[PDB]
Design a protein around this nucleic acid. Structure first.
Lengths: 100, 129, 88, 55, 271
RNA sequence: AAGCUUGAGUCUCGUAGAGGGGGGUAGAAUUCCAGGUGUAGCGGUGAAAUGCGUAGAGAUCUGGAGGAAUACCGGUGGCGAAGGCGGCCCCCUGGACGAAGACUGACGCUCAGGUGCGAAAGCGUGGGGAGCAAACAGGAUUAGAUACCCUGGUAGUCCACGCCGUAAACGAUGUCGACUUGGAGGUUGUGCCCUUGAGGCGUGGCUUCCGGAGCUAACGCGUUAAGUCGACCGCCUGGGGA
């Protein structure tokens, strides 16, 4: 399977939406035997400029190794939420743990 | 891309003299050997050597004494659009008699005097000065 | 490019161990597999023409290779056209 | 370390005007400068940099 | 395309056709219909009061839910249609467990769309969420001015209306005429833009159609005798004198608004 | 009518591309519109006027809509048969390049007439419409100004399905291969090395500025040649008139 980060922002005052998607996502990726290398949470982080007065991220990444037609379920579910920004899949460059 | 192996043999005679080379190398053939055979016998080259069991390469040996060329003119004459044939008494003189002509004949490659010795005409395939 | 599901899976019918790519007969079946792959690139991205310009070369390479095989050996040509769909 | 997506590494290759620095101070041995100058533009779309300092 | 008929005769040499496989062209559902009956442009005493209107054949009334409310009960489009009494398309909607109703269709060509009833609903076209609960800059489809009158403006084919602002009890909104106005933000609206936009694309190219299009041909005030229209002529191609109405009034460039009741909500008129 | 393996073809497996075309994602301002807010200026210029404003401009602040094109990076750095190609992200996809093997066995070049690509502007049919802008509409200048310049502004620019086929399409260099003393700078595979090297020495494919032999009316070309040796297709014969 192709390598992908699967990274998404989510505003910290909206963090209740994350267990409402990631607990369904991890079961879909284990159903696809995806490795889920990272599954890491970065506390709270700032953005490079404020966007519609929201300037903060809850910031989580999975690093999945998963099929193109399984990440389509993630792509369409982030697009279904829409209030989540910069939901990116960041292909290739092999697996990552601790990032040096 | 590449059509004439005898034009691609006459290049070698000019290219090597322009670089003052003691020997020059080219792709070999039974016809290019039949011509190198005459180039040695008419005193223009000192020797010829073919090396390669499946892809033979022809090496022609030159000698100098004054830091200058040894053949100042060599010409292919008969070419695919215009071949020139001559009959046993109309055989051509080269540079008012100071050069020689090469004939393919009905037998094999020889000079205009060796052709006039046997009594043969044919295709005029080279001039050499 | 053309998938490995067309360039390795051909050794199921034109062989049993290794491929014979210079045989002319394999090149006709390979150019038919290119046509089936690039007809999958139709009806979408319709302002891109490089696959159609490439197909215009594949269809004539296929006809030339068939004719050249018939000129080499009518038995090896007969051996090919019985294992092609032919005539649509 | 060794990657452009960390801001404490990334900030060493850009200026207080948002511009990219000359090769003499990027450590790319003048052989990965082209690729690093594109990785810095990719950091704008990863929410690490603004697209210009004047906005 | 928009495909044009091959030249064989007048007016067919100009005719164009446009199609939708998901449109239903067959007869309407009978439990949502009233007779209406045409008034012939004539009053109660039987005298003409409006010209060149109400001829042709039968044209019924669809019972439309222009006051539609409910909460938490979504509906699906069961059928998509047209109606010769208007210019836009009509959708037949079926609610979650039962009852068929009509609504004015948003932009798009297909049926099967699901729409929500409620105030806490999503910002999707066809939803009943009030102008108090939209993010501003949205398009409101068919707009309501009073709850006992219902959806009263922006009902024609290809129409749209954008919101400008929200302030106090009101929202300030644009219009296709240039009219700038404020309306109470508690009104439901209909959300999105109106569909069809092809009601003008008709050609026909034959003059006999007036009757089947509900009207009859008009005669010129300059071509008739001066006893039945104040233009009077002339003589043809001899117009002579300044334009007026069939009723003796100057109206070209002369304004006629005088209601004394509603300029209190309207900051700028037609442009 | 049978052979040869150098050029050429093809494959499992890799290598770098602004080549071709989608669907998401994104910033700002000229403008249209409703408030916040301060006072008569703004705009243009050699000066002013038309225009924008005084019914509150421009400036400054908020909220919203609309659309092309993608600033910097950016270039003597890639890619395409040319025209040209450019924000990012994930796709669809032709070509080219590589290493070890294998299978063909001249499959190599060009081509009468054919058969096919567009930069911008234009058309055929309907949408989309923020800049901008032929025409249109005005002002200035001048003796005059149907122009320059300034102020407004329609087609058009954009999207689909077709047409137009033309350009400094310019590197003023028709197209295939082989052969060739040099300097200076890049781009990308691959083999062997503690890479104990700011990589190095080999081997492949590309690419830029100078320069010597060669070419030439002289300018210009110079290993990616206008050189050298060959294969092929079109046109020219003083200009005006055309």
């Amino acid at each position: 399977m192709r390598h992908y980060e699967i990274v998404f922002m989510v505003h910290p005052d909206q963090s209740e939406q994350v267990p409402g998607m990631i607990e369904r996502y991890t079961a879909a990726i284990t159903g696809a035997e995806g490795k889920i290398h990272r599954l890491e949470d970065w506390g709270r982080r700032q953005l490079a400029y404020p966007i519609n007065k929201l300037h903060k991220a809850h910031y989580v990444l999975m690093n999945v190794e998963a099929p193109q037609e399984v990440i389509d379920e993630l792509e369409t579910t982030f697009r279904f939420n829409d209030a989540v920004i910069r939901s990116m899949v960041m292909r290739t460059k092999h697996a990552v743990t601790e990032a040096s | 891309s590449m059509q004439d192996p005898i034009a691609d043999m006459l290049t070698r005679i000019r290219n090597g003299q322009a670089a003052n080379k003691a020997a020059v190398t080219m792709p070999s053939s039974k016809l290019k050997v039949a011509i190198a055979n005459v180039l040695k016998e008419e005193g223009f080259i000192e020797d010829f050597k073919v090396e390669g069991d499946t892809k033979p390469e022809l090496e022609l040996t030159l000698k100098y004494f004054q830091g200058k060329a040894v053949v100042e003119s060599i010409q292919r004459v008969s070419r695919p659009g215009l071949r020139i044939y001559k009959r046993k008494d109309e055989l051509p003189k080269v540079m008012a008699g100071l050069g020689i002509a090469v004939v393919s004949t009905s037998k094999g490659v020889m000079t205009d005097r060796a052709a006039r010795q046997a009594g043969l005409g044919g295709e005029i395939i080279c001039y050499v000065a | 490019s053309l998938s490995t599901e067309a360039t390795a899976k051909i050794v199921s019918e034109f062989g049993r161990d290794a491929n014979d790519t210079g045989s002319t007969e394999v090149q006709v079946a390979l150019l038919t597999a290119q046509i089936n792959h690039l007809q999958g690139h139709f009806a979408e991205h319709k302002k891109d023409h490089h696959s159609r310009r490439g197909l215009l070369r594949m269809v004539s390479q296929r006809r030339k290779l068939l004719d050249y095989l018939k000129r080499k050996d009518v038995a090896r040509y007969t051996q090919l056209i019985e294992r092609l769909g032919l005539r649509r | 370390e060794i990657d452009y997506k960390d801001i404490a590494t990334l900030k060493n290759y850009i200026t207080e005007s948002g511009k990219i620095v000359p090769s003499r101070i990027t450590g790319t041995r003048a052989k990965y400068q082209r690729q690093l100058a594109r990785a810095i533009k990719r950091a704008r779309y990863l929410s690490l940099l603004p697209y210009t300092d004047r906005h | 395309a928009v495909v044009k008929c091959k030249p064989t005769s007048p007016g067919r040499r100009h005719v164009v056709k446009v199609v939708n496989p998901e449109l239903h062209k067959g007869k309407p559902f009978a439990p949502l219909l009233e007779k209406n009956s045409k008034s012939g442009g004539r009053n109660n005493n039987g005298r003409i009061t409006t010209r060149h209107i109400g001829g042709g054949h039968k044209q019924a009334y669809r019972i439309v839910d222009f006051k539609r409310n409910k909460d938490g009960i979504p509906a699906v489009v069961e059928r998509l249609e047209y109606d010769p009494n208007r210019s836009a398309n009509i959708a037949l909607v079926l609610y979650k467990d039962g009852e068929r109703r009509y609504i004015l269709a948003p932009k798009g060509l297909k049926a099967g769309d699901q729409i929500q009833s409620g105030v806490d609903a999503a910002i999707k076209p066809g939803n009943t969420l009030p102008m108090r609960n939209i993010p501003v800059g949205s398009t409101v489809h068919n707009v309501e001015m009073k709850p006992g009158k219902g959806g009263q403006l922006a009902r024609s084919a290809g129409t749209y209306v954008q919101i400008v602002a929200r302030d106090g009890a009101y929202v300030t909104l644009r219009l296709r005429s240039g009219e700038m106005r404020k309306v109470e933000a508690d009104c439901r609206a209909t959300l999105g833009e109106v569909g069809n936009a092809e009601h003008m694309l008709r050609v026909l190219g034959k003059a006999g159609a007036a009757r089947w299009r509900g009207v009859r041909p008009t005669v010129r005030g300059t071509a008739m005798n001066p006893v039945d229209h104040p233009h009077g002529g002339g003589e043809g191609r001899n117009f002579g004198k300044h334009p007026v109405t069939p009723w003796g009034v100057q109206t070209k460039g002369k304004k006629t608004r005088s209601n004394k009741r509603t300029d209190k909500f309207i900051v700028r008129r037609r442009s």
